């Protein structure tokens, strides 16, 4: 009764970073050798558990969050980091547990004209709480005069676009990110490896 | 504060081939002001998040200004190539900082046609990062030495950006300011408020 990691890693389109997706995994046997056949340069940094020994373990509840970010912003996906992404789009708890996977996907998310479907929040009044999603699209008031719903002086639009292209540098090509969030609870294990 | 008014509100900008270079240091530089340059403009930032530029500190900050074609601004980026990138202004691959470009239709256009904005066309070799070339000797394209005549296989290397308001968006003048941040072992002084 294998877990459905194929429908998470082999999906046709990943969600935007600001409106990131969430998936629940439970009641299945999870073997992690299947995802080693991915792109040969996938970063597999794991906090709280060594990456190689993830098979013979009995987690209680497992999640999976997927989104697409720039090449240089893959560093901001770590506990305690700061920046635009770590504050306004996706914030990890300080005592985070689980692994992160990030592989370059220039061949799937890049258009010569420009892929405008991937956005990212730029302005917010306060930092995000750990694991909080905010998809509101109101005008940001950076001054004192009320915006009243107009994007004029001192009233900016919170969202920009990751206009991906295949001619961009290595640091601006898209990277697909999947974050697994294991845990241990009082209830007994529902997902166990072989 | 820090003198951005002299760099962002100057009457005229230098040609792309003979671009300017301004040294900025020991000032309180507020980068939040630059978000009101235009309703829509390019603010790509390389190696630094623009949202945390208001508290970092740098030993020196460099400002480079010029005017280029509207559709040709994409060449000002690390690891890119084209006409501006490898003949006029080369950005190093290990580049940290931001690039700012906004349309300048109402300031650098003439019905008769502006001829004061020039771009170099012919070179025997490309440009290393951050290197200028203001030489205007006649270019040799063939073999026989033309010793200073504009025949064929021997042309003047500099052409003109014949700017005019009737052009399309791709051919419209665009003012570009490139900030080149860096840190050294020296103490940093350029810090936001």
């Amino acid at each position, epitope marked *: 009764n294998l877990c459905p990691f194929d429908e998470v890693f082999n999906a046709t389109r990943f969600a935007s970073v600001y409106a990131w997706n969430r998936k629940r995994i439970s009641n299945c046997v999870a073997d992690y050798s299947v995802l080693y056949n991915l792109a040969p340069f996938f970063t597999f940094k794991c906090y709280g558990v060594s990456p190689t020994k993830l098979n013979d373990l009995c987690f209680t509840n497992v999640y999976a969050d997927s989104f697409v970010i720039r090449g240089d912003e893959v560093r901001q996906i770590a506990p305690g980091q700061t920046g635009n992404i770590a504050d306004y789009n996706y914030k990890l708890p300080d005592d985070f547990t689980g692994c992160v996977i990030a592989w370059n996907s220039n061949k799937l998310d890049s258009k010569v*004209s420009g892929n405008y479907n991937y956005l990212y929040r730029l302005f917010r009044k306060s930092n995000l709480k750990p694991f909080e999603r905010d998809i509101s699209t109101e005008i940001y008031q950076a001054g004192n005069k009320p915006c009243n719903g107009v994007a004029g002086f001192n009233c900016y639009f919170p969202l920009r676009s990751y206009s991906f292209r295949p001619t961009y540098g290595v640091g601006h090509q898209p990277y697909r990110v999947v974050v697994l969030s294991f845990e241990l609870l009082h209830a007994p294990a529902t997902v166990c490896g072989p | 504060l820090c003198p951005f008014d002299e760099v962002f509100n100057a009457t005229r900008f230098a040609s792309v081939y003979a671009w300017n270079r301004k040294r900025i240091s020991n000032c309180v530089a507020d980068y939040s002001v630059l978000y009101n340059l235009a309703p829509f403009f390019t603010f790509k930032c390389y190696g630094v998040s623009p949202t945390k530029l208001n508290d970092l500190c740098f030993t020196n900050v460099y400002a480079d200004s010029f005017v280029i074609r509207g559709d040709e601004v994409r060449q000002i980026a690390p690891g890119q190539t084209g006409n501006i990138a490898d003949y006029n202004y080369k950005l190093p691959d290990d580049f940290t900082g931001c690039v700012i470009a906004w349309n300048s239709n109402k300031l650098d256009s003439k019905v008769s046609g502006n001829y004061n904005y020039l771009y170099r066309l012919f070179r025997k070799s490309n440009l290393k990062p951050f290197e200028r070339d203001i030489s205007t000797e006649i270019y040799q394209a063939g073999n026989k030495p033309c010793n200073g005549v504009a025949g064929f296989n021997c042309y003047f290397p500099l052409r003109s950006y014949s700017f005019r308001p009737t052009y399309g968006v*791709g051919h419209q003048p665009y003012r570009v300011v490139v900030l080149s941040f860096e840190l050294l072992h020296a103490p940093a002084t350029v810090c936001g408020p």
Partner: antibody, heavy 121, light 108 residues
């Protein structure tokens, strides 16, 4: 759920210009992108351009630059297509399309009923 | 520009049969493609985008595949409401060209 309604038929002299409206009702206006496609009287379809009001980016076809302008009105949630300096072969049937943010901006998800433009004496 | 051609120009089929429409691009367009269906005198209808994803509301008998400079569209079981004209479209790089248009008809 989202249906698009265009204007009526138009007949113009060769040396004139045309304005075509495209009202879309339903959903959120911010995440909407409008594209325009022209169909010849007996030939296949033809692409003209794409407008994204939320990001303020516009792109037109190669031959149509300097003649066609596509704008959108947020308050009236309509779209406009201005084609100036008409010619004899510009007569065709004009369609208005919508690009959804979730699906794709460039792909046309919803279509208008279309309008017919005739240029003659 | 990228020039796309379809084949065959005209197809003749009967109800319950399986048909395939071949679509080729002059240059590589990655995995960006779209398929449309236009009935005589009516506005088109989106069927498939990204060459594999199926638009919501489209019946399950349709299916597409392709990687680069070669794409196909297949109908598992033809129905009386499937006789129309089909157009390709690529949205990689500006000037998003369409296809020549394949017309599918009935066999008498």
């Amino acid at each position: 759920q989202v249906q698009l309604v265009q204007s009526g038929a138009e007949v113009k002299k060769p040396g004139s210009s045309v304005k075509v409206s495209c009202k879309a009702s339903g959903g959120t206006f911010s995440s909407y992108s409008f594209i325009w496609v022209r169909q010849a009287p007996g030939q296949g379809l033809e692409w003209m351009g794409r407008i994204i009001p939320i990001l303020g980016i516009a792109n037109y076809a190669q031959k149509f630059q300097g003649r066609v302008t596509i704008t959108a009105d947020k308050s009236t949630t309509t779209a406009y297509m201005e084609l100036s300096s008409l010619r004899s072969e510009d007569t065709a049937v004009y369609y208005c399309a919508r690009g959804t943010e979730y699906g794709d901006y460039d792909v046309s998800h919803d279509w208008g009923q279309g309008t017919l433009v005739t240029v003659s004496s | 520009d990228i020039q796309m051609t379809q084949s065959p120009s005209t197809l003749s089929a009967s109800v319950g049969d399986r048909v395939t429409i071949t679509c080729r691009a002059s240059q590589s367009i990655s995995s960006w493609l779209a398929w449309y269906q236009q009935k005589p005198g009516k506005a088109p209808k989106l069927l498939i985008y990204k060459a594999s994803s199926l638009e919501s509301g489209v019946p399950s008998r349709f299916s597409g595949s392709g990687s680069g400079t070669e794409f196909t569209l297949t109908i598992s079981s033809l129905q009386p409401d499937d006789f129309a004209t089909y157009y390709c479209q690529q949205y990689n790089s500006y000037s998003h060209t369409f296809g020549q248009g394949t017309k599918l008809e009935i066999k008498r």
